[model samples]
Target: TGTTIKFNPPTGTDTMVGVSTNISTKHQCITAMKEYESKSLEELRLEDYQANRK
Candidate 1:
């Protein structure tokens, strides 16, 4: 199966950013997006930065 990715731009002084991943299934991407959306963008970026630094 082929999967498509998408991005949502930050809005209204929001410091968040996100994109869809390859973890594809029927509407699974939407689920993933919702989960990712639940976390603060700064937290996501901080964890991502720290994860790669080790």
Candidate 2:
């Protein structure tokens, strides 16, 4: 079975910088996109920044 992977930004925080992972029949790529929503202050961390670089 094939499954599509979709990562949606947190609601109301999609406008901010974010990344989404999508792997579907229509498309298969580890793509990144800037979301259009707001993020929680606690969500910002060094680990998050480091992971984003990878």
Candidate 3:
């Protein structure tokens, strides 16, 4: 199995938003570069804000 960085968008009830994998031989820390890859910061922030209101 490879190391993976999982990102849960700030918005939405869904927990499994997206994942990035690192299958290289070397061990390294995963980054948050994909945090807003599919969704923007504003969108994520809005989602989190709404979810917390529920």
Q: What is the C-alpha lDDT of each candidate?
A: 0.42, 0.32, 0.41
Q: Please tell me which model should have the higher lDDT, number 1 or number 3.
A: 1
Candidate 2's C-alpha lDDT? 0.32
List, residue by residue over 1-54, the lDDT tens digit for candidate 3: 121335443322222325844342322222234434565556666666766731
Clashing pairs in 2: 12-38, 13-37, 13-38, 14-35, 14-36, 14-37, 15-35, 15-36, 15-37
- Residue range 1-54, candidate 2, lDDT tens digits: 011234543222223225654432322222321331233323433335655632
Tell me which of candidates 1 and 2 scores higher on TM-score.
Answer: 1
**Clash count per candidate:** 0, 9, 0
Models, CA RMSD each: 14.9, 14.7, 15.2
Tell me the deviation in Å of residue 11 in model 1: 15
lDDT for 25 in candidate 2 is: 33
Model 3 pairs whose backbones collide:
none
What's the residue-level lDDT of 39 in candidate 2?
38
Tell me, by lDDT, which candidate is best.
Answer: 1
> Cα deviation in Å at residue 9, candidate 1?
8.8
